[PDB]
From a paper:
To comprehend the state of the CotB2wt•Mg2+B•GGSDP structure, we determined the structure of CotB2F107A under a Mg2+-rich condition (CotB2F107A•Mg2+B). Interestingly, a single magnesium-ion (Mg2+B) was bound to the active site, coordinated by the residues N220, S224 and E228 of the NSE motif and two water molecules. Therefore, we suggest the binding of Mg2+B to be the first step in preparing [name] for substrate binding. The position of the Mg2+B matches perfectly with that in the CotB2wt•Mg2+B•GGSDP structure. Moreover, the conformation of the Mg2+B coordinating amino acids are oriented in the same manner as there are two water molecules in our structure that mimic the oxygens of the diphosphate group in CotB2wt•Mg2+B•GGSDP. In the structure of CotB2F107A•Mg2+B the salt-bridge of D111 and R294 has not yet been established and the remaining C-terminus could not be resolved. This suggests, that the accurate positioning of the diphosphate moiety is required for the formation of the latter salt-bridge. The overall structure of CotB2wt•Mg2+B•GGSDP is most similar to CotB2wt and CotB2F107A•Mg2+B as indicated by a low root-mean-square deviation. Hence, the structures are likely different pre-catalytic states of [name]. The [name] mutation [name] afforded cembrene A as a product.
Author numbering:
A (entry chain A): 15 to 291
B (entry chain B): 12 to 291
The structure:
Amino acid sequence: RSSVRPYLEECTRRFQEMFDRHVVTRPTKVELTDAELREVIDDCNAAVAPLGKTVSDERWISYVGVVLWSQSPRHIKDMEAFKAVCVLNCVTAVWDDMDPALHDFGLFLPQLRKICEKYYGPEDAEVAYEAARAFVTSDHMFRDSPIKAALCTTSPEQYFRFRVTDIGVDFWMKMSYPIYRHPEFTEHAKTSLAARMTTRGLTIVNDFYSYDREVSLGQITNCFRLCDVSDETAFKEFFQARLDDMIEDIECIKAFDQLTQDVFLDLIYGNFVWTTS
Amino acid sequence: DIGRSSVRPYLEECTRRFQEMFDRHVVTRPTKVELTDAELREVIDDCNAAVAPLGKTVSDERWISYVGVVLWSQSPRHIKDMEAFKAVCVLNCVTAVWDDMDPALHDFGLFLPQLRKICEKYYGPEDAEVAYEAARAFVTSDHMFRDSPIKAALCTTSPEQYFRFRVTDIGVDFWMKMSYPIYRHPEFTEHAKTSLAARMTTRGLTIVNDFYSYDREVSLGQITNCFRLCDVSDETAFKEFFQARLDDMIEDIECIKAFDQLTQDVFLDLIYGNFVWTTS
Ligand SMILES: [Cl-]
Ligand SMILES: [Mg+2]
Ligand SMILES: [Mg+2]
């Protein structure tokens, strides 16, 4: 029960087969110029320096890969917004990986505001900042919280309801809509319907490939703790149920407008490609 | 299908079973905020000023029917800011009229500035922006999804997709984001701003709303009702569906009890108060 390694190959193949049948369109990686990647890394370093944390270029590049693979390159209009999502993703990933004893909101929150004010217009900057603030504040609030225990152990429905915020997808949507400048996508981002539609597909993939690491650290925010992964029959029924969840979401996503559904599906499928890369 | 046009045969039994569930699981009864006649006149005058640019005349009696949900579904023991409370009264009522209006008469250029005016009158500068954005997103969502293929997909596929739509569409996310200044409670404020507050309360609010508005909505051809996902003409299929919805409400309520005391008081007063107002 400590590991999903016996299922790693089969589940990877089954994820890919599902995407090939229901999405078809493959993710494509955004290539940053050397100048853009250096500007991103310099902003990341500047933002986490007040916390006294050193992070290598290699670690920044591993954090940023999800952004490079999970946006929708054919629809990008604003590369300043794109770089902002690169930076905000990376620096909040560092914050998400830190011991809460090193969490200094007075030092970090002004750095998030500075990033938002550099890359976004005034209105978008407020929206992106509030979402980043809500995300890091949620991360802090729910470490060792009875609420997290109740939501993550009760049922898949309560667990994914928690993960809408906790996996960062509502934040992601609210900092990503300026990349596309697409009115319908902007509204779905702001109502969080965008995040609610894509939460299960992101979370189930994240959870499968981070299960071994997370259970070894005593973390409970993983839907595969809701089943007995040591019982092959129980695991296979649970995994199929999660695949069915992803498929139901994907098929509803196809009712959205063409640009919006490309963004949603590139996000779910790109996250899978980056996670397995 | 006339047999599917009504939940009237189940009206008494379902009302009794809702109440029984609340008595077992919430216990604490809702209590009604009473406004002074000055407060209520101020609320209604703001409501009239807000909808007059759209050519709507609304009697005091109709306003009072709209506002009863705020009076019954807030948490009086925890109120700290009655200016924020009056703002929730006005915003609920004026967006209720907008929700009931001919979508032809929808004039965002005239209405959105009135919403901002209400928010700027009653809230501090930061809270006014949060309440206004939530009102804006709600009325815009209402407009976007009339005759939308997205609404049809989310509302006919499964209860999960339907309640996902209703987090915004029934207005609970808006409600949480305009109500947190009433309580000035840091944890509740955060749950409102992440929308976890809305996500926890959506089913309890929607199931009750849907049951008691089913007849009117299907008579109007409206599809945003979870009881269209079952055959209400089939007593066996209806009672199994209704029991599953009751189980949803109970699971939400039992999880809500893991939140801090003040927050859970607010969440449960909202669900239970909405039921009391709806059946009155
Ligand atoms: Cl805001
Ligand atoms: Mg994980
Ligand atoms: Mg209704």
